[PDB]
Amino acid sequence: IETVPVKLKPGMDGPKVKQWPLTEEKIKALVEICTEMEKEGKISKIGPENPYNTPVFAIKKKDSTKWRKLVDFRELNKRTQDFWEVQLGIPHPAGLKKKKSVTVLDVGDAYFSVPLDEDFRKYTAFTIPSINNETPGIRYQYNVLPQGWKGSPAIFQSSMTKILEPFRKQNPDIVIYQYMDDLYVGSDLEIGQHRTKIEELRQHLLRWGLTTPPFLWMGYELHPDKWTVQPIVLPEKDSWTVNDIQKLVGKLNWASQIYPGIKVRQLCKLLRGTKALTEVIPLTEEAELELAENREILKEPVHGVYYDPSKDLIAEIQKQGQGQWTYQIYQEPFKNLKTGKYARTNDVKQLTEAVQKITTESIVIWGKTPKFKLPIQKETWETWWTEYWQATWIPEWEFVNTPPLVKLWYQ
Amino acid sequence: NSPISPIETVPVKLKPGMDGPKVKQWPLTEEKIKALVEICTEMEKEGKISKIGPENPYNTPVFAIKKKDSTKWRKLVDFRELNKRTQDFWEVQLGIPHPAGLKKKKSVTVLDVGDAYFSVPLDEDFRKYTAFTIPSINNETPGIRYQYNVLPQGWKGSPAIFQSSMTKILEPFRKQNPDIVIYQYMDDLYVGSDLEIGQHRTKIEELRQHLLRWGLTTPDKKHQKEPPFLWMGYELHPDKWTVQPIVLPEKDSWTVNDIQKLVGKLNWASQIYPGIKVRQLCKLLRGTKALTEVIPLTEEAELELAENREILKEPVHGVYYDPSKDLIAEIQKQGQGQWTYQIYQEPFKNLKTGKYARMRGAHTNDVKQLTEAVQKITTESIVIWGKTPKFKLPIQKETWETWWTEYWQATWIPEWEFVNTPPLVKLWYQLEKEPIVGAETFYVDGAANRETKLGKAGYVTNRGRQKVVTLTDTTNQKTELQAIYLALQDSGLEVNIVTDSQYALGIIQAQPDQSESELVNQIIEQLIKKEKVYLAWVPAHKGIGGNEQVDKLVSAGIRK
Numbered sequence: 027i028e029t030v031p032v033k034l035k036p037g038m039d040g041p042k043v044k045q046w047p048l049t050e051e052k053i054k055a056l057v058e059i060c061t062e063m064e065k066e067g068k069i070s071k072i073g074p075e076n077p078y079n080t081p082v083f084a085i086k087k088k089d090s091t092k093w094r095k096l097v098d099f100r101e102l103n104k105r106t107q108d109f110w111e112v113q114l115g116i117p118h119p120a121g122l123k124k125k126k127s128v129t130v131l132d133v134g135d136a137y138f139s140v141p142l143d144e145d146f147r148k149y150t151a152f153t154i155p156s157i158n159n160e161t162p163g164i165r166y167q168y169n170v171l172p173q174g175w176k177g178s179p180a181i182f183q184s185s186m187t188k189i190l191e192p193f194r195k196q197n198p199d200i201v202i203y204q205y206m207d208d209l210y211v212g213s214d215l216e217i218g219q220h221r222t223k224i225e226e227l228r229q230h231l232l233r234w235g236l237t238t239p240p241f242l243w244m245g246y247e248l249h250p251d252k253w254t255v256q257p258i259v260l261p262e263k264d265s266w267t268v269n270d271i272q273k274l275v276g277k278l279n280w281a282s283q284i285y286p287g288i289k290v291r292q293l294c295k296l297l298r299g300t301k302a303l304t305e306v307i308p309l310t311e312e313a314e315l316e317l318a319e320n321r322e323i324l325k326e327p328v329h330g331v332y333y334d335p336s337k338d339l340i341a342e343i344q345k346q347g348q349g350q351w352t353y354q355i356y357q358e359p360f361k362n363l364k365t366g367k368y369a370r371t372n373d374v375k376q377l378t379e380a381v382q383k384i385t386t387e388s389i390v391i392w393g394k395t396p397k398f399k400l401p402i403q404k405e406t407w408e409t410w411w412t413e414y415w416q417a418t419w420i421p422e423w424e425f426v427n428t429p430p431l432v433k434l435w436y437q
Numbered sequence: 438n439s440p441i442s443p444i445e446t447v448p449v450k451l452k453p454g455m456d457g458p459k460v461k462q463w464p465l466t467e468e469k470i471k472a473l474v475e476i477c478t479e480m481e482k483e484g485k486i487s488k489i490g491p492e493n494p495y496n497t498p499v500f501a502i503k504k505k506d507s508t509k510w511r512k513l514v515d516f517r518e519l520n521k522r523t524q525d526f527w528e529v530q531l532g533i534p535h536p537a538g539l540k541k542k543k544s545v546t547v548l549d550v551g552d553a554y555f556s557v558p559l560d561e562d563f564r565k566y567t568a569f570t571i572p573s574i575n576n577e578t579p580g581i582r583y584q585y586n587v588l589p590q591g592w593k594g595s596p597a598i599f600q601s602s603m604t605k606i607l608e609p610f611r612k613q614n615p616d617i618v619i620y621q622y623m624d625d626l627y628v629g630s631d632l633e634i635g636q637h638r639t640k641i642e643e644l645r646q647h648l649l650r651w652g653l654t655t656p657d658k659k660h661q662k663e664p665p666f667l668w669m670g671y672e673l674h675p676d677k678w679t680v681q682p683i684v685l686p687e688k689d690s691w692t693v694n695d696i697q698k699l700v701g702k703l704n705w706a707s708q709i710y711p712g713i714k715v716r717q718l719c720k721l722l723r724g725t726k727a728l729t730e731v732i733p734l735t736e737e738a739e740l741e742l743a744e745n746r747e748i749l750k751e752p753v754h755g756v757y758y759d760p761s762k763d764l765i766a767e768i769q770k771q772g773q774g775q776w777t778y779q780i781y782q783e784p785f786k787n788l789k790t791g792k793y794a795r796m797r798g799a800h801t802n803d804v805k806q807l808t809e810a811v812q813k814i815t816t817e818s819i820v821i822w823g824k825t826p827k828f829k830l831p832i833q834k835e836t837w838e839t840w841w842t843e844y845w846q847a848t849w850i851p852e853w854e855f856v857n858t859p860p861l862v863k864l865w866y867q868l869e870k871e872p873i874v875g876a877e878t879f880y881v882d883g884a885a886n887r888e889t890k891l892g893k894a895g896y897v898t899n900r901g902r903q904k905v906v907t908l909t910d911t912t913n914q915k916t917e918l919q920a921i922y923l924a925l926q927d928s929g930l931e932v933n934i935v936t937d938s939q940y941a942l943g944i945i946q947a948q949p950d951q952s953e954s955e956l957v958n959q960i961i962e963q964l965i966k967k968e969k970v971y972l973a974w975v976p977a978h979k980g981i982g983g984n985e986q987v988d989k990l991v992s993a994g995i996r997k
């Protein structure tokens with residue numbers, strides 16, 4: 027089991043990221059987990075000559091009551107990008123998103139049997155903090171491929187290929203894609219048969235010593251062929267006020283930055299003069315046709331917008347109320363690659379659910395996670411997100427307060 | 438002299454690509470040279486340093502200093518250059534213990550480690566970089582060169598390597614005495630047990646002997662300090678803690694220096710004295726004079742300072758923490774952006790107090806501020822106690838509900854209850870969801886010339902009114918707000934307003950009750966006086982009726 031050498035992005039040094047405060051419950055969980063990992067040889071205590079740090083958290087597995095350690099390798103991942111993307115890049119299959127069902131299987135346990143390059147171990151340092159700074163934090167580094175580092179599947183790739191070879195050969199129309207600690211397995215089979223194949227796959231994995239409804243933000247399976255447009259939708263009324271038309275024109279105006287063809291000339295003609303907002307304006311036949319044409323446009327996709335693999339994805343999310351959230355993924359603004367809605371607690375719980383759902387979709391569609399613009403105070407998110415987080419990855423995010431009418435225009 | 442620990446050394450590197458320091462030694466007075474020879478001879482005998490030859494090419498300057506009314510010489514090594522070239526280490530402490538987080542113990546003992554750094558060995562491979570040279574008289578001949586065998590004073594790695602050494606040394610003691618609490622802080626150990634006083638003193642002796650087996654000396658029973666412990670600006674007593682005495686000077690003339698020092702002391706006091714305020718005192722420092730310039734106290738600053746003296750006239754203490762009980766946090770509004778809080782487990786025996794002021798953003802309301810305060814206290818509690826408090830808040834459940842469900846940001850206050858402690862947090866107006874029948878519709882707009890900074894604000898209305906006011910040294914943003922303000926002034930109790938300013942709309946939709954902008958404050962005053970206000974947006978320059986006509990009105994002479 028010779029290790030694979032790993033270089034950082036030349037000129038970059040390792041991560042030095044502050045450990046965020048943890049509740050006692052989570053500190054105790056982590057101490058217990060890490061003690062067992064240390065015994066098994068997966069990690070080792072380190073001394074102060076290691077200046078590096080990566081935050082750790084504890085989350086709940088599945089719909090299970092067992093604690094799981096989540097390491098936030100976002101920084102290390104950014105600093106090792108030439109390694110896992112250029113050098114050992116896992117290609118992403120375009121057929122996955124076209125399958126009727128896709129099942130997500132956690133294979134993170136595979137990594138702990140593969141030694142980590144000795145010169146790289148230092149960059150995987152992490153700290154278990156104490157309460158009230160009673161004692162210095164407990165410091166460890168990894169001796170094995172760690173869960174959450176994009177390098178680990180990059181390195182484990184050739185092993186995963188051997189593991190999956192008989193299964194892929196016997197099932198040539200099933201698509202299997204690895205992203206970070208998970209496998210995504212898609213078929214066009216009837217669901218019973220699909221699940222029978224998944225159980226078969228599990229047995230193959232089991233033979234390599236990998237002994238792998240849970241979430242509210244997704245079901246047993248994903249159904250990506252189901253995912254279809256969230257059209258900007260225009261209201262339908264038998265009576266129109268000046269205020270209603272003004273609303274409509276504002277919505278159409280902003281719709282026209284995304285969709286070509288959108289016209290408002292005729293609708294604005296109806297607003298000539300300085301009118302009372304509640305005055306009823308009967309639509310002339312011209313305005314009616316303009317409105318009809320606009321509806322047709324909004325039902326169809328946007329000509330000319332394509333994913334660019336050299337560019338980051340961005341996701342924006344709006345709170346719509348009554349447990350509803352809207353979202354758009356783009357790379358250049360107004361050039362929406364995908365829009366949608368997540369529905370049905372508290373605000374922070376629901377938002378973490380939407381984020382996990384949107385990221386999963388994005389993995390399936392592009393093999394990349396978006397950077398989220400989250401409508402919430404930074405500290406509130408940082409305090410609470412781990413209470414509800416169940417994914418083994420963590421997308422990039424930043425915090426915005428982007429009112430007002432961007433919300434109106436998506437529902 | 439003293440033991441050097443037989444603990445394993447920490448391996449230490451220079452930063453990649455860099456070599457050790459080679460800084461020239463300056464000639465020294467005969468006096469200083471003689472002092473250093475005596476000092477280094479004794480340090481060498483005690484194993485702290487060793488003689489080396491001209492074979493080692495490294496050097497750091499050395500100096501000797503003896504104070505003017507004193508006979509004791511000291512050696513000073515200037516490790517600035519070695520420090521610049523030494524690797525980064527893990528940070529020593531992410532924070533310091535808050536006394537309110539301490540759990541009360543029957544007996545507490547403080548043990549300070551004597552000559553801490555000098556009792557820990559330095560990595561053998563790194564010692565060469567610590568070389569220094571006592572020069573000969575008038576640098577005629579070769580100097581006497583030495584290197585360190587132990588952690589030097591002022592070297593970058595000493596604090597961290599000392600801490601990790603102490604951590605390792607303590608590990609087996611902790612493993613065998615899980616009941617005993619031992620805080621590590623700098624060269625100190627603070628050691629608490631609930632043992633009877635006889636068995637506690639026995640365990641302290643066992644600890645001292647354990648530490649001695651590892652080359653670390655500590656004070657014996659006789660020399661050990663007794664409570665209350667004066668520690669980092671706190672007093673720690675057997676069943677309470679507080680801040681050390683705060684002296685608030687009486688002065689004819691306050692310097693900026695005096696005012697800065699006062700505010701610092703008041704801020705320190707606020708962690709246990711409830712309701713301390715510093716807002717008016719802080720306002721005085723928002724100038725640009727510095728140091729010894731005299732700032733006259735304003736009346737509001739005099740009133741604030743007087744109220745603080747009253748708060749501080751009699752001692753106040755906090756209690757320690759009991760982990761088997763919930764933490765309860767209460768917050769009150771003190772007015773003008775100031776908030777104060779107390780945290781207790783049994784009413785009303787505070788573990789600690791605090792204040793929150795922060796203006797987040799240009800414009801805000803009390804519901805947002807309260808939420809921010811709650812967030813701050815929540816984080817502080819996780820840090821000090823490892824759990825979140827239950828809150829008691831001066832806002833009705835219905836008010837909170839209306840706000841969060843309608844607001845566009847995700848919010849989540851954890852477990853809380855309304856407490857009727859006026860002033861209560863509320864919202865002071867609300868915008869209509871629908872346009873108002875029988876109300877005049879105003880179409881407002883503002884324009885400003887970027888070159889001249891002149892502008893116009895104005896309205897037209899469906900009842901045929903119009904008005905334009907001229908403005909100077911303004912901006913497009915300000916003119917758009919000026920226009921809304923005009924419409925509010927000139928309208929009756931119910932009014933519909935149509936703006937093309939997303940900026941204005943965003944500000945007003947968030948129901949601000951306070952602003953850094955006087956204009957926004959004037960608009961809020963009007964909004965509260967109205968019975969019904971409907972505010973709507975339209976895109977600019979689309980020939981939308983009403984908006985088109987006010988646009989032409991305010992652009993005249995300003996923009997084409």
Ligand SMILES: N#Cc1cc(Cl)cc(Oc2c(Br)ccc(CNC(=O)c3[nH]c(N)nc3Cl)c2F)c1
Nearest residue numbers: 534541542543544627628629666668673674675
């Ligand atoms: N100097 C000092 C110092 C600083 C800190 Cl942060 C802690 C410290 O010792 C304590 C420890 Br260990 C544990 C609890 C407390 C709070 N005080 C007591 O429990 C206490 N009990 C008794 N008998 N005296 C004192 Cl003081 C402790 F004070 C001593």
Ligand SMILES: [Mg+2]
Nearest residue numbers: 882883937977
């Ligand atoms: Mg305008």
Ligand SMILES: [Mg+2]
Nearest residue numbers: 883884913917
């Ligand atoms: Mg303008």
Ligand SMILES: [Mg+2]
Nearest residue numbers: 882937977988
């Ligand atoms: Mg305009």
